[model samples]
Target: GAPATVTEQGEDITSKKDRGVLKIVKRVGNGEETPMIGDKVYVHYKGKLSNGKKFDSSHDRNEPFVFSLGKGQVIKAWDIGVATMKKGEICHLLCKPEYAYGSAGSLPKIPSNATLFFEIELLDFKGE
Candidate 1:
């Protein structure tokens, strides 16, 4: 069997300041509109470590996660990668540790210095 889409290599898609921390590859393209900084964005995501161990999934809970785009409410990679996404778009984000949990990882689920891979879908977003 073929490997999952998320396990494949992703293209660099970060801002100039964000270079070297994130790689994003599109899986599905929905629209041209993207979310703004203060917009409330909803997403479904599956988070996994480089070793292919899954750590989290919004779909498993049947609840789309919500957050303000460009805010620090989530990890650096989510803010940057999701901000570049459009409604109904699905993308694979490969993030270095610094762009995720960094030296001090989220306890219990993620380990320190762990690289994160997220297959994220942008459901929708509403501007404030």
Candidate 2:
């Protein structure tokens, strides 16, 4: 099956800035207990659009996100930055287009060059 495609509307610079600040706060708070690269982690998350539209969420789905830090299996932003997180930590991720779906958005919802907001809670980790 083919992956979904995202379109580009217009840029919302203010939302981008706010999301950036949230990301900084998230990283700062989790700075003490950083996850190591290749560490497998379980996380709960809620993602929303700039307009406050709920796009995706593990909570809503009654599931958790499990992945490995620095793994290319996910988005580029998470792959590079999730290593700075640790278990039992809550962090907000601000994903710019380059770090997210890039010019090819996720279709029907996320737009191209759009930024995303993610409230992430690290639940556990498995050392790799």
Candidate 3:
């Protein structure tokens, strides 16, 4: 993995800055639907610190992570960002600590108050 580099490629993540998540789309899927609240979604992802050191990877484990959208099952950023993405789309997410692990970062790998980046693929999702 490489270090985190902010580039001028993707459109601004969202219109609402109150949430503090930014995203860049790498691939846009043709699917007409995005996950709705309570939907179960499947995804593959790689998470890295802002410095570009990887903290986790589902691809490395050969498994996709699953969770319910807008259900507090995952971080706030995933709920908002993924909902804006369609099935089969791939996007890069820049998550501010508030939307990520927050003042309490997840253990040994992620540090306190650190920003994170993630490359995610929404494989599929089932409606609520």
Candidate 4:
């Protein structure tokens, strides 16, 4: 397993630029191995609403999430966001509702048309 990485607390994790679907905050790493479609990704993430309300956290669970990129195993925002990252890279994904849960958002935490912030760490991945 690849050693996990972490950023300093209170660091400004924002970025000056972004992608067409959403923005990406590169906290660290520029490895040569960026993920591609059909690759399985192992990632840790902290998810919050725009208002800073915490919804989910991999750290809290003490386990990383695993999914196949481009196979619709996760949300579109995540599929797009993690696909752009390399192993050992940490990035924050700024996703709007269109790329997220959409107009009829999931209940209890996410609201309709809500924007989300995900602090993502790409631990490791393997191609199909």
Candidate 5:
């Protein structure tokens, strides 16, 4: 597989203010129907640490992760990053500590201040 190019259209969509939430689009979505606040989004993802260690995966359980957009049920990176996605889109989100579990980290899997990498596919969304 080839590494992503910085100049590609819609690939490097990371904002300047928060470089921690780096989003790289892997596959384009169908339309412009992106989720809004209070919308329930369904996704399949594989979460890993920066060193390539596996942390979590919704796909492994054969169930897509479902959550309300912009509700802060997940990490900060997810709330910010997944909000910009459209249905059927797939992207890689690189989350810094501040955007993730932070220094406390999640027990038994994630480490303190660990940088996380997640390959996420937006399956669908239900409007509020």
Candidate 6:
């Protein structure tokens, strides 16, 4: 399978601090603060492609996802994004290829260089 190439536009990486992908629409807590590696969090979220195609949703399923932050149990993007959030806060995350599936994308729907949009609501965090 061939990887999809996304052209970088003017708004891309304006500053050196920019990570290229993973643009944070809103930061509830301190931007530099992240959840502990072993912390467990309850979250409600919806996953959609750049073109508005939905792939998954906790709200739609009527169930929430609880997982340990930075545990490497899921995709790399999710691991990074969830760690940067706090309880009771909502975030809009935009993930690019480097932060997501990378060159070889996931099977079924996700494609290479595909930008993903995540609407995540941090329900609670269980910290030690």
**Against the true structure, whose TM-score is highest?**
3
lDDT against the true structure, each candidate:
0.78, 0.64, 0.81, 0.71, 0.80, 0.67
Residue 21, candidate 5: C-alpha displacement in angstroms = 0.5
Worst ten in a row by lDDT for model 2: 1-10
Candidate 4 shows a clash count of 0
- Clash-forming residue pairs, model 5: none
lDDT by residue for model 3 (23-99), tens: 77788886588889999999999988877688999999988999998889898888888899888999888888888
RMSD of 6: 6.0
User: What's the TM for model 6?
Assistant: 0.73
Residue lDDT tens for model 6, 1-128 = 00022223212322343544443434364334457898887889888787768888999878899888888887766787677676566776667777678888788889877777777888777786
lDDT of 1 at 116: 83
Q: Name the 10 consecutive residues with the lowest summed lDDT in model 6.
A: 1-10
lDDT of 1 at 34: 87
For model 2, residues 17-75, the per-residue Cα lDDT tens digits are 43222243243343367677778888888887766688988987787889877768788
Which scores higher on TM-score, 1 or 3?
Answer: 3
**Candidate 6, clashing residue pairs?**
none
lDDT per residue (tens digit) for residues 1-128 in model 4: 01111212222222433332454456666657688888878989988886768898999989999888988887777777787777788876667677789989998889998877778898889876
Question: For candidate 4, what is the lDDT?
Answer: 0.71
Clashes of 2: 4
The TM-score ranking, best first, is: 3, 5, 1, 4, 6, 2
For every candidate in turn, the CA RMSD to the true structure comes to: 2.7, 8.5, 2.3, 6.9, 3.0, 6.0
* Residue-pair clashes per candidate: 0, 4, 0, 0, 0, 0
User: Model 6 Cα displacement at 44 (Å)?
Assistant: 0.8
Q: Model 1: per-residue lDDT, tens digit, 1-128?
A: 01144335455565665443444546666658889998999999988887778888999998999998887999887888887887788877877787888899889988999888788898889987
Indicate the residue-level lDDT of 91 in model 5: 88
In model 6, the Cα lDDT at residue 66 comes to 86
Q: Candidate 3: global Cα-lDDT?
A: 0.81
The segments of candidate 2 whose C-alpha lies over 4 angstroms from its true place after superposition are 1-22, 25-31
